[PDB]
Amino acid sequence: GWRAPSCTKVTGDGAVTFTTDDGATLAPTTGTLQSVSYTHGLVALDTPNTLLATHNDELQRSTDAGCTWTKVATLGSGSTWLTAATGGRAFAWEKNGGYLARVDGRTVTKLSSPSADIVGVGTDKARRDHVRLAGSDGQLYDSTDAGATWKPLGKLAFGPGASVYTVSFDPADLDHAVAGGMTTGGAVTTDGGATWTAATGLSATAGGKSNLFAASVSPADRNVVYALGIDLVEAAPNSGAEGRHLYRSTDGGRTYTRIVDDTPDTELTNSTLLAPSPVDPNVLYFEYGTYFQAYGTDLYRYDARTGKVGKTHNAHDGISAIAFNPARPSVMYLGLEEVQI
Number of residues that bind its own copies (CB under 8 A): 34
Q: Which one of 86, 200, 223, 290 is in contact with its own copies (CB under 8 A)?
A: 290
Q: What is the rounded distance in angstroms from the CA atom of residue 278 to the CA atom of residue 218?
A: 7
Per CB under 8 A, which region of 14-22, 65-73, 85-93, 269-277 contacts its own copies?
A: 269-277
Q: What is the rounded distance in angstroms from the CA atom of residue 153 to the CA atom of residue 191?
A: 10
Instruction: Establish if 213 lies at the interface with its own copies (CB under 8 A).
Output: no
Q: Which is nearer to its own copies, 119 or 153 (CB)?
A: 119
Q: Are 334 and 17 in contact (CB under 8 A)?
A: yes
Q: Which one of 94, 137, 231, 262 is in contact with Ca ion (CB under 5 A)?
A: 262
Instruction: Establish if 137 lies at the interface with its own copies (CB under 8 A).
Output: no
Q: Which one of 137, 142, 287, 317 is in contact with Ca ion (CB under 5 A)?
A: 317
Per CB under 5 A, which region of 69-77, 124-132, 245-253, 313-321 contacts Ca ion?
A: 313-321
What are the two backbone dihedrals, phi and then psi, of residue 294, each rounded to the nearest 5 degrees? 50, 40
265 binds, among Ca ion, its own copies, none (CB under 5 to 8 A by kind): its own copies
Q: Are 171 and 141 in contact (CB under 8 A)?
A: no
Per CB under 5 A, which region of 94-102, 224-232, 290-298, 321-329 contacts Ca ion?
A: 290-298
Q: What is the rounded distance in angstroms from the CA atom of residue 177 to the CA atom of residue 196?
A: 9
Closest CA to 115 of 131, 130, 129, 95: 95
Instruction: Establish if 271 lies at the interface with its own copies (CB under 8 A).
Output: yes
161 binds, among Ca ion, its own copies, none (CB under 5 to 8 A by kind): none
Q: What is the rounded distance in angstroms from the CA atom of residue 156 to the CA atom of residue 163?
A: 11
Question: What order of strands is seen across the sheet that includes strand 318-324?
Answer: 16-19, 332-337, 318-324
Instruction: Establish if 337 lies at the interface with Ca ion (CB under 5 A).
Output: no
Closest CA to 140 of 101, 168, 102, 103: 168
Instruction: Establish if 340 lies at the interface with its own copies (CB under 8 A).
Output: no
Q: What is the rounded distance in angstroms from the CA atom of residue 105 to the CA atom of residue 125?
A: 17
Q: Which residues pair with 169 in a beta bridge?
A: 177
Q: Which is nearer to its own copies, 194 or 315 (CB)?
A: 315
Residues within the interface to its own copies (CB under 8 A): 38, 40, 79, 94-96, 237-242, 261-267, 269-271, 273, 288-290, 292-293, 295, 298, 318, 320, 337, 339
Residues within the interface to Ca ion (CB under 5 A): 262, 268, 291, 317
